[PDB]
Design a protein around this ligand. Sequence first.
Ligand SMILES: Nc1nc2c(ncn2[C@@H]2O[C@H](COP(=O)(O)OP(=O)(O)O)[C@@H](O)[C@H]2O)c(=O)[nH]1
Ligand SMILES: [Mg+2]
Length: 166
Amino acid sequence: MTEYKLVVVGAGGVGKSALTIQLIQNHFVDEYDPTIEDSYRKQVVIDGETCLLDILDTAGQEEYSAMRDQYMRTGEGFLCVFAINNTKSFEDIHQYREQIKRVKDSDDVPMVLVGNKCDLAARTVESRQAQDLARSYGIPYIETSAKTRQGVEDAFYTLVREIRQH
Ligand SMILES: Nc1nc2c(ncn2[C@@H]2O[C@H](COP(=O)(O)OP(=O)(O)O)[C@@H](O)[C@H]2O)c(=O)[nH]1
Ligand SMILES: [Mg+2]
């Protein structure tokens, strides 16, 4: 069975965790402690072939850590969750495209900028300037929501497809 890694990254309030656990348990966590490290995996099928996915939420255990940097070089699916109803998460994606570029030091990662928190009318981030941020690095732009399994499929799917080519 093939196996791909999903280097998840974003902010501490975008919905990257609830997106992961939701895909597995499917219960929308409304109180997950960000101070917990672990690797969630799934064994679903894309379109006929199964494929295990080692998703890493990467939280942070006190200072030092030294584990997120070694993961930017191991996994290749960069699902950079970006909460459009936060705005600060968007500015986080800005510098987040330099550390991943640091590790691979090649500017050629299967990058994917997602837009979590799209299940609402309050849109602080328009759907235009964001299109220019992703198109800048030649990466797809999506919008998911862990509070209703909406878009979660378009994110994990576009990630396994980009890695398939690379
Ligand atoms: N309405 C809504 N709230 C969400 C969604 N995803 C996350 N949240 C909320 O935003 C907070 C941050 O998510 P959490 O997974 O706890 O932290 P993360 O690690 O930054 O994702 C949570 O307390 C959720 O209640 C979503 O799709 N819709
Ligand atoms: Mg978390």
